[PDB]
């Protein structure tokens, strides 16, 4: 099955998922000088006050914090988006070392990790229908750098011991994703894809300019997770990022001057 090792990692994915070589793949390098300021772009509207987290899952490639997406409770709108996108889950990608881990890069800079808040367009009714549409998802990407601790991340860090291995889940109610946001909602946006199989070209990417800071101790706990299932040979869950893909015929737009 696909993964992040030398025999099943990103350079192999195209054999099972030929869209891996498609025209709108993610992530990409954000060349800050080439991104065009678009005064038509609206402020992002992030409405997470009624978010209902339910559960955290180690799925063997990352961990997902899952939300109740059966009502407009945690929604993204505005920015580059038409209509309303409901939060279904967030997860991270991270490195073995602080010098790598992000999927998007900024002028070729790699951050220690990247948070993806995944939302689906309510006009398609369910996530599975949304991923079949070119405007089906909006993923809000937030870079992580190592420095000060992020207090709002610690509840996530502290439950990871209970989901060490693939297939483990834990109740994870009352988690407020507002505690993972930076101060500024300035962003870049472009049309792209899921960054894991099935690599569907269904995402409007919204990447925040301002990173969040997390502590060395917080990211070190991400790196204690396992890709393997319980009672299998230990394979640390590190370097679960896809590198930058060709931009092809795309424009990256900036919300800010
Ligand atoms: Zn992701």
From Swiss-Prot:
Changing residue 118 to K/R: Strongly reduced CO(2) hydrase and p-nitrophenyl acetate esterase activities. Optimum pH is 6-8. This is Carbonic anhydrase 2. Substrate binds at residues 195-196. InterPro entries: CA_dom, CA_dom_sf, Carbonic_anhydrase_a-class, Carbonic_anhydrase_a-class_CS. It catalyses: hydrogencarbonate + H(+) = CO2 + H2O; urea = cyanamide + H2O. The gene is CA2. Zinc. Can also use cobalt(II) with lower efficiency, but not copper(II), nickel(II) and manganese(II). Zn(2+) binds at residues 91, 93, 116. Changing residue 139 to F/Y: Strongly impaired activity. GO terms for cellular component: apical part of cell; cytoplasm; cytosol; extracellular exosome; myelin sheath; plasma membrane. It is linked to Osteopetrosis, autosomal recessive 3: A rare genetic disease characterized by abnormally dense bone, due to defective resorption of immature bone. Osteopetrosis occurs in two forms: a severe autosomal recessive form occurring in utero, infancy, or childhood, and a benign autosomal dominant form occurring in adolescence or adulthood. Recessive osteopetrosis commonly manifests in early infancy with macrocephaly, feeding difficulties, evolving blindness and deafness, bone marrow failure, severe anemia, and hepatosplenomegaly. The modification Phosphoserine is found at residues 162, 169. Changing residue 194 to E/H/R: Strongly reduced CO(2) hydrase activity. Changing residue 59 to A: Reduced activity. It holds the Pfam family Carb_anhydrase. Activated by X-ray, histamine, L-adrenaline, L- and D-phenylalanine, L- and D-histidine, L-His-OMe and beta-Ala-His (carnosine). Changing residue 61 to G: Impaired activity, not rescued by 4-methylimidazole (4-MI). Disulfide bonds: none annotated. Changing residue 62 to S: 2-fold decrease in enzyme efficiency, as determined by kcat/KM ratio, and efficiently inhibited by chlorzolamide. Changing residue 195 to A/C/H/P: Strongly reduced activity. Its EC number is 4.2.1.1, 4.2.1.69.
């Amino acid at each position: 099955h696909w993964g992040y090792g030398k025999h099943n990692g990103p350079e192999h994915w195209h054999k099972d998922f030929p869209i891996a070589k498609g025209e709108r793949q993610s992530p990409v390098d954000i060349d800050t000088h080439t991104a065009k300021y678009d005064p038509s772009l609206k402020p992002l509207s992030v409405s997470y006050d009624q978010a209902t987290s339910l559960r955290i899952l180690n799925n063997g490639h990352a961990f997902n914090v899952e939300f109740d997406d059966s009502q407009d409770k945690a929604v993204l709108k505005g920015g580059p988006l038409d209509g309303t996108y409901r939060l279904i889950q967030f997860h991270f990608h991270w490195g073995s070392l602080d010098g790598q881990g992000s999927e998007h890069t900024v002028d070729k800079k790699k951050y220690a990790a990247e948070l993806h808040l995944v939302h689906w367009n309510t006009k398609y009714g369910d996530f599975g229908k949304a991923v079949q549409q070119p405007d089906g998802l909006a993923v809000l990407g937030i870079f992580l750098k190592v420095g000060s601790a992020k207090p709002g991340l610690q509840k996530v860090v502290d439950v990871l011991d209970s989901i060490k291995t693939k297939g483990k889940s834990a109740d994870f109610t009352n988690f407020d994703p507002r505690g993972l946001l930076p101060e500024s909602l300035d962003y870049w946006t472009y049309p792209g894809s899921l960054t894991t199989p099935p690599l569907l070209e269904c995402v409007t990417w919204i990447v925040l300019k301002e990173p969040i800071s997390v502590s060395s101790e917080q990211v070190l706990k991400f790196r204690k997770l396992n890709f393997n299932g319980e009672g299998e040979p230990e394979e640390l869950m590190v370097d679960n990022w896809r590198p930058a893909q060709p931009l092809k015929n795309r424009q990256i737009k900036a919300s800010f001057k």
